[PDB]
Symmetry: D2
Subunit: 237 residues, 4 copies
């Protein structure tokens, strides 16, 4: 029922629903079967960094995941989001575990949206940046198992007392304010987001990954979207 | 019941409750009887501009109202907002009419909040800027008579069909997201806001003006705060 | 001798050197014969607005020119600027007249450059914004006939006393500070610029237009690059 | 000959020229004998963080030095910089050693200047942020012993091969572009800067500290301003 555009960091290859048989980043447009992907050397235990970028002039959504000192995977997909998203949306992060599991820690998150026309480069803008999460974060909507305060961190999926990931968990966090991503007079709309994540898995076969998603404002976790559906899509079509 | 800190643009001198007998800007801390004011040459029909500024190192809240080509009135008040506001607040604009009346148009509005510690100048930030208001502004909470879309403008108080101000009107608009204005580890918290307003009055004796206010997150118009109480305070104590 | 990447607003079609036989925007990479163009309805006398955007993940340089209420022309070109520009450059505007002429007024200009790695979305940044030009603008390098102060405006090419454009004129303006546009560790470098221009021509056959260009830091006007060479390139190859 | 406004981090108490007999931060206006100071618990070996802030409405210059987990010293001084600085200035950092010595490492630096009038909150702005210094930093003017590239760090004063501070050293670094700090129409001018520093001293009696200074654009090290004069002032009057 929801419209979802997402960039997925996928740590487990469900080949039966279109996954490359490796860890990959991907671009999803309304479906979990990514429109485009790229091989990703998931570095268990290391803190990574994901940048998403988009602007309506170029009409190309791009993403990069990089680890401190070395690797970057990267992926882009030309798409015009005017005819996909609604002009008001909410922005968030999502992650799930299933049979196998991993921590899905978000250590920081920032987003910037601009609607520019001409009028001497005049704008509408939203910007937020958490470089630390409070135990009482009144400006995040937490959904599912998502919790905060865990060392100043956003724990998207459930973790037991000692610091071990639990299975079939699904959490999401959305910024509280609606976002006006597109508008018909805007000669250039654009956005870009970054978050630093730490994925850790003991059972060295992690699952399921994390996603940054833009949705219709009233989105909530579809029934039975733990594991391979990333808490985003209600089926795998 | 609400905690309010506000900067008031007061167009009508209610001397019986502590007003200088002229148009003034003022700084209110929990009371409508301003802690500090300054004479203001209200320029009926002209578009003005107000800048509010604060930072917890200097502990001095300041405001300026200026009209295109010429006048600025200005006012500051040393106050430590740690021991006044709650650490989560909502930010908004407010305006009312009473026996006499004026249009209370807001043409644009922007706000920026930062919580900085050290860690190589690292931050938490919120920022929004409307340079035009939509007819369906999903990120403003409108209270009272406040409406949008009126030529891309925020009409804080009621105006009849032809463009004439109505009496005893009270509207408010608050940004949708809670704001974390203060936090105990922040070595410097700070904020600053600007809005451009157009006040017009036919009955050349305008009232009551406009205010930018920070409140507890769940604030709403106190009963019978039209006219001299600016839709902010429930009594005049 | 110079390396130039530029986006040209071309008001006069020199078909003999590869121009579409109409007003066009274009993307130049080291040559005046654009790599890509788009038809442009030059609106003599109206103030227009140009946005340039680039980021090294998508590797696509895009531009839009829009006039207040209505038209936008737009153009993009996938190019990897790592292997074109030097990692330190200067940024500027350029414009020329020749046999025919036009005013080449810049009313405002802003630019933003970021070099991001990971390290929790940490950056290097430069940003400037002139919304008005001083008569003594110590942070612009003016070259050729370029002058400031003309009503708070940057007059790229020569204009006589009464406000009439002169022929075979060439001016350029560059921001004073070198800019570090690219660096080998940056997992995402990006920039974007906007300027509002007012072109006016009495002899209703205007020439030669305006360009935003990135060059090696020590660039200066090539000999005899008035008219169709926009003060950018020394020949038309 | 130079006009200097500076905030000094002073690690060595020269009581004979007006120092409190302890490590202090201070505000200097044209003289090394600070207008105002505050006790500072210099934490040898730890990375500290300094925030300077100013805006022309409040007319109060403030500074904070804080160390990770714990201490902050703080100091403010009401001063109107319109009648002190020239409207074009350069901004920089400075540090010196003398008989005793310390490393004077700058690990990052950022600055933001705005000239706002009304016109719906419209601006002129400069902003730069180095979160790492290059070996070939084309946008810094280095003066005296100041060098870069030293682990991605700005080494304001001379350090020998193994990492030991040398005596009677004086370095300065200024951002390349002139800065327009004040202008007569600005209804609010404002600036703010941050840098992270690491001071280390083996001879546990460190000297002389570091300063952030605004000067006339053509400033250079006064003769014999090593040690207690911080490379800023030519005498101690
Ligand atoms: Ca999967
Ligand atoms: Ca009143
Ligand atoms: Ca041409
Ligand atoms: Ca001293
Ligand atoms: Mn996948
Ligand atoms: Mn009052
Ligand atoms: Mn051309
Ligand atoms: Mn001192």
């Amino acid at each position: 029922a929801d419209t979802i555009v997402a960039v997925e960091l996928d740590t487990y290859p469900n080949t039966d629903i279109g996954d490359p048989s490796y860890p990959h980043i991907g671009i999803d447009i309304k479906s979990v079967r990514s429109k485009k992907t790229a091989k990703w050397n998931m570095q268990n235990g290391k803190v990574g960094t994901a940048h998403i970028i988009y602007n309506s002039v170029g009409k190309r959504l791009s993403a990069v995941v990089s680890y401190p000192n070395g690797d970057s995977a990267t992926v882009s997909y030309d798409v015009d989001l005017d005819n996909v998203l609604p002009e008001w949306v909410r922005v968030g992060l999502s992650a799930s575990t299933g049979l196998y599991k991993e921590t899905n820690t978000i250590l920081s998150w920032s987003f910037t949206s601009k609607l520019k026309s001409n009028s001497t480069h005049e704008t509408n803008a939203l910007h937020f940046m958490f470089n630390q999460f409070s135990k009482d974060q009144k400006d995040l909507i937490l959904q599912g198992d998502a919790t905060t305060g865990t060392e100043g961190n956003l724990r998207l999926t459930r973790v037991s007392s000692n610091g071990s990931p639990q299975g079939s968990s699904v959490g999401r966090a959305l910024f509280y304010a609606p976002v006006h991503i597109w508008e018909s007079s805007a000669v250039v709309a654009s956005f870009e987001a970054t978050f630093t994540f730490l994925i850790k898995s003991p059972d060295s076969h992690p699952a399921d990954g994390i996603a940054f998603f833009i949705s219709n404002i009233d989105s909530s976790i579809p029934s039975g979207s733990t594991g391979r559906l990333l808490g985003l899509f209600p089926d795998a079509n």
